Amino acid sequence: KLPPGWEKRMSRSSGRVYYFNHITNASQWERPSGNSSSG
Numbered sequence: 001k002l003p004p005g006w007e008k009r010m011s012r013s014s015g016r017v018y019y020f021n022h023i024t025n026a027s028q029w030e031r032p033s034g035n036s037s038s039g
Helices: none
Strands: 006-010 017-021 026-028
Touching: none
Parallel strands: none
Antiparallel strands: 006 017, 017 026
């Protein structure tokens, strides 16, 4: 899971908004928390 280096990214081909780590280099679908996660 993401956040040191992240962005919420649209799939610029066909499907979904995904969520991204910059410096690992990993695409998932997660808003990582806020303050509490909960999910």
